[PDB]
Amino acid sequence: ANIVGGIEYSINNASLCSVGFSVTRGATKGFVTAGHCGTVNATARIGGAVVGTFAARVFPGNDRAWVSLTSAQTLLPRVANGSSFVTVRGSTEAAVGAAVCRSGRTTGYQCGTITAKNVTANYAEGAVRGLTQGNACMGRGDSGGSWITSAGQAQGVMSGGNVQSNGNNCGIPASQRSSLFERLQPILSQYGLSLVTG
Template sequence: MRMPRFRFVPAILLGLALACPAPASAAEPDAEGTAGAPLGGGSQLVIGSGARCTAGFAAVSGTQGHLIAGPGCGAIGDSVTSAGIPVGTVAAASFPERAHTLIAVTNTSDWELVAWAGTEPASIAGSAEAAVGAPVCLLGSADGARCGTVQAKNVTINFPEGVLSGLTQTSACAEPGDRGGTFLSGDQAQGVPVGGSGDCASGGTSFFQPIAEILALYGLTLLTG
């Protein structure tokens, strides 16, 4: 069995002043399936029969690579592709018990796991938790990147499916249609989006599950670069 290869890609620091870079799809392997196309945070994924989702982060446990995304990015056992090429399967997903989706990357012939695979430059140097009042950006698929500040922590939200606690609240707006995405504060990974209210025209509020909780739950190491 071929083991995954992990590499770290130097990138430009994510700007937080006026705007943030928008995520884009992962590089597509050529028609002959060139090995090693980058796959990571910012990659556009297709789940099962066609639901689309944006990967949040890449992480590893030993030699097994994973993508971490928000909730609603598939059910356990669902197949996952990107650019029409198989990626792997959903390994963990149960909302609201787990406000995230974990995808096991099993196709290591066509994909090489990296910290960031969006075409816009971004840097992920670690996962230091941003304080209340710190700048934060949500990189999603519906309308590029939206920035705001951390407003509160350990927030509890009542969803139709149940109660979810331990969330971080931000003033970064989330547009309807976003599924998955990435919260960053500078070059530090913060979490994956869970939900929000309002919109980017009138202003809104968004929530994310902290990445540190997800990494600890599965014993994962965040890819940086």
């Protein structure tokens, strides 16, 4: 499969999440995603085919993971925006007030701005600390998907937020949305990964 940020993958034939970013660890191909998406060794599939397994994850506390893929996968330095793509150029962290967009299999590509950093989400499983908050909307299934600036600086991966009863926070004004992402920098250093760029 062609690995692009934002596309759907399933975990153990049950849960759905979105790919965050193509990465490599030495000769190993992988993608970073959210820790809540799977436990170590869970099976990820794209379009019904097995593409790899969860190599490591941390959740709750943090919310990160990487999936090691088979050598047949093609890694691409891109994030889906509808039928178009955003090229990944690096991982400089943007500041509060910057515009950012996120991509995921449920709500597609949505943009907003960064409103706060170092936010704690008290999920039922336990708290997740240090997340960055944005006001782009998102829904069930977007977890793990890419957060990136239009200039291509990858910011992190979708964790969670204040989903409403219709399964997203897109039906409430941007001022009332809390859409949280795990910063990418610490995931790259924690697992020794290099982002694929173009």
